[PDB]
């Protein structure tokens, strides 16, 4: 996160760290949707152009984290994956269309003060909140500049009109994506950056006061560059696939 701020303790009890064993390092962000399900970007696990192909045996999930590099002794829980589910149609070939993956934890995690699931949007929620001008929240432990924080970073970003999103890149944009960030003439800034991927873009419902995951940090050309925006996987759009694998397995 560029132009972000340190999160407060328990600000994002759903934030998950994807961490590889050997060499031990931050892979990506993630989000707890249930006691045994973690949602991330597929590009975190599979990206052939970069020879990236992670099996479950390669990963560890860290929930309830605040410090980036520290082993938060009595706070965080470390989970082993049972099985990873990449959307069968994720397009790593062209534009990261359908950049979503589900990870089944080997054993359910106990909730606490620092570990709590975020809500998945329903049709009316998405309909209400997914509007240009509406700010969402991105959290992560990724680069600070296009340079690594000690603590979870946060920034609030406004959803941008589809046209403006389309017009800011040469990349082929789909319905399974949205963009967010400030416009050059808005005088505020910030964005996600390397290591932020798979992290949640969440909004708080004014109807019921709950936090819903509207998006997933997918991509963007550089970090916080003017006239450029961040692209997020649109969660509602891929909700039935998510529903499909949860109910199936």
């Amino acid at each position: 996160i560029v132009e972000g701020s340190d999160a407060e303790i328990g600000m994002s009890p759903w934030q998950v760290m994807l961490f590889r064993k050997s060499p031990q390092e931050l892979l990506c962000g993630a989000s707890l949707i249930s006691d045994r399900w973690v949602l991330t970007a597929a590009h975190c696990l599979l990206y052939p152009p970069w020879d990236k192909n992670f099996t479950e045996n390669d990963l560890l999930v860290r929930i309830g984290k605040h410090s980036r590099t520290r082993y938060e002794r009595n706070i965080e829980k470390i989970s082993m994956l049972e099985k990873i589910y990449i959307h069968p149609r994720y397009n790593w070939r062209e534009n990261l269309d359908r950049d979503i993956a589900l990870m089944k934890l080997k054993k359910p995690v106990a909730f606490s003060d620092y570990i709590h699931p975020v809500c998945l949007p329903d049709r009316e929620t998405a309909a209400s909140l997914l509007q240009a001008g509406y700010k969402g929240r991105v959290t992560g432990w990724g680069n600070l500049k296009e340079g690594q924080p000690s603590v979870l970073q946060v920034v609030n970003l406004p959803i941008v009109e589809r046209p403006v999103c389309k017009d800011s890149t040469r990349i082929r944009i789909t319905d399974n994506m949205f963009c967010a960030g400030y416009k050059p003439d808005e005088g505020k800034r910030g964005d996600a950056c390397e290591g932020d991927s798979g992290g949640p873009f969440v909004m708080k419902s004014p109807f019921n006061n709950r936090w819903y995951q509207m998006g997933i940090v997918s991509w963007g050309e550089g970090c916080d560059r003017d006239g450029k925006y961040g692209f997020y996987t649109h969660v509602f759009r891929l909700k039935k696939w998510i529903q499909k694998v949860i109910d199936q397995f």
């Binding site: 600000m11 909730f111 620092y114 709590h116 699931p117 809500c119 700010k135 946060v154 708080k204």
Partner: peptide, 26 residues
Amino acid sequence: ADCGLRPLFEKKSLEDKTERELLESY
């Protein structure tokens, strides 16, 4: 179920320092 209701915030009726920024954009 209990989703999106933060233990340290919503459950205690405490507001994070920038959440109002969000609810104001709505």
